C-alpha cells in the first residue's frame, strides 16, 4: 500500500471482461454475470440463479507496464445444505498468455490479493477468474506512474454450451481446464455457457442468448443431462432442432458443433430398464445433424463425444478416488481432453477459426 498507487475502477474502459455477457455493479461492487443479471429469473429457478455468476471461463484483461498488481475482491462459495465439506479457490495471473502466478484466494470476505513481481515492461495482464465461485472486484491497484491500456486483440469468438459436469473440477487451475487450454492453443475468445447438468437441457433462454452473442465457433454437447432425470428423449429431437434454428436467426453460417455426449462410466453403464440410454440419446443428436446438413445447412457437424472421451479412457485421467465414481479428469486429463476435442473439431474443418 502507498498513496501515489494507481486506482483503478473495475468499470474502467481500459478493463476489458472476456466471457462474462453482462457485469453487475453493486454497491461498489462489479460481478461479472455468464447471462444478462437483469433477467437471470428467465434462465433458472430462484436457488440456481447463482450458478450464472460463478466465474468459469471469466477473464480480466488489461496491458499495463505495472511490477505489481493488487485486486480488492470477494469470493462466494455456493451455499451448502447441512451435510457439510471441508475444491482450493485459485485465480490465474497469465502474462502474455504465459502462466505467471496461481493466487489462493480468501472466501466470503472482502479481502486483497496481491501479485508482486510481475514482468516489467508494457504486457498484456489475464486474470483468469475462479471456476466454481461468484468473484466481485471492487477495486484494481498498480504502481504509481504506471501506464493503463485497453487490450485490442480481437480474436474469434467461441461459444461453449452444455456437459453434465462442472468443467473447473479436477483442472489444476482456472486458466488449466480442458476449455481454457483449447481456447489458448486455438487463439480463440472463450465463452462458456457451461452450467452442469441443469443448465444443458436445451432451454430455449439459452439458444437466444446464443443466437445475441459473438461467435464464429459454436459447440453444443448434450444429451446425458435429460437422460440423468430419465425425461425429455420425446421431445429432445424438436428440442436440438428448435435450438440451432433459434442460433442460425443471427449466426447463419457460423460453425454449429453439435456433440453427443463424452462418455460418463456411471451414466453409460446403468441397466437399460425399457427406458431410453445414453446412447439412444447420443443417435438423436446424430440423426438431427443429418437432417439439418441433407435440407441445406453446410455448417452443421457432428462431433462423437466417444470419440472425444470414450471408454477407452483410463483411470488415470480421472480425478476421484476407487471409493467413488469416476467422473472428472483429473490435471492431466483436462489437458488430454482439451487435444482431444481440438483434434476431433479439426477433423471437421472448423479448427483453425483465421
Known amino acids: 500500500r502507498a498513496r ?132 466481485r472486484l471492487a477495486e484494481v491497484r498498480l504502481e504509481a506512474g504506471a501506464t493503463l491500456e485497453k487490450d485490442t486483440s480481437s480474436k474469434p469468438h467461441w461459444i461453449h454450451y452444455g456437459d453434465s459436469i462442472c468443467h473447473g473440477r479436477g483442472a489444476a487451475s482456472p486458466s488449466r481446464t480442458w476449455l481454457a487450454l483449447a481456447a489458448r492453443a486455438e487463439g480463440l475468445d472463450l465463452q462458456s455457457l457451461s452450467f452442469a447438468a441443469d443448465g444443458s437441457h436445451l432451454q430455449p433462454m439459452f439458444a437466444r442468448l446464443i443466437r445475441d452473442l459473438p461467435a464464429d465457433l459454436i459447440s453444443l454437447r448434450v444429451g446425458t443431462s435429460n437422460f440423468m432425470d430419465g425425461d425429455g428423449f420425446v421431445d429432445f429431437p424438436a428440442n436440438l432442432v428448435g435450438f440451432v434454428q433459434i442460433i442460425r436467426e443471427r449466426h447463419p453460417l457460423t460453425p454449429i458443433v453439435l456433440g453427443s455426449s463424452v462418455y460418463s462410466p456411471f451414466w453409460d453403464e446403468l441397466p437399460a430398464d425399457d427406458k431410453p440410454t445414453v446412447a439412444d440419446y447420443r443417435e438423436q443428436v446424430v440423426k438431427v445433424a443429418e437432417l439439418l446438413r441433407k435440407h441445406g445447412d453446410q455448417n452443421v457437424h457432428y462431433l462423437d463425444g466417444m470419440r472425444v472421451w470414450g471408454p477407452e479412457r483410463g483411470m488415470e485421467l480421472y480425478l476421484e478416488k476407487p471409493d467413488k465414481y469416476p467422473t472428472h479428469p483429473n490435471a492431466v486429463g483436462h489437458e488430454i481432453f482439451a487435444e482431444s476435442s481440438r483434434r476431433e473439431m479439426a477433423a471437421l474443418g472448423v479448427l483453425p477459426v483465421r
Do not use: N
Not at 471482461?17 to 443479471?37: C, E, I, N, T
Not at 451435510?83 to 479481502?111: I, N
Open 4 to 135: 501515489a498507487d494507481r486506482s483503478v475502477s473495475p468499470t474502467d474502459p481500459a478493463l476489458t471482461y472476456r466471457g462474462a455477457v453482462s457485469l453487475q455493479d453493486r454497491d461498489g461492487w462489479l460481478a461479472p454475470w455468464r447471462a444478462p443479471h437483469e433477467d437471470a429469473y428467465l434462465y433458472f429457478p430462484k436457488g440456481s440463479v447463482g450458478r450464472l455468476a460463478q466465474t468459469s471461463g471469466v477473464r480480466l484483461h488489461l496491458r499495463t507496464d505495472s511490477p505489481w498488481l493488487a485486486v480488492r475482491y470477494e469470493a462466494v462459495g455456493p451455499k451448502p445444505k447441512p451435510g457439510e465439506p471441508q475444491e482450493p479457490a485459485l485465480l490465474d495471473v497469465l502474462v502474455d498468455g504465459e502462466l505467471a502466478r496461481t493466487v489462493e484466494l480468501k472466501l466470503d470476505a472482502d479481502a486483497e490479493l496481491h501479485v508482486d513481481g510481475l514482468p516489467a515492461g508494457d504486457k498484456l495482464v489475464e486474470l483468469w477468474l475462479p471456476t466454481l465461485l461468484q468473484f
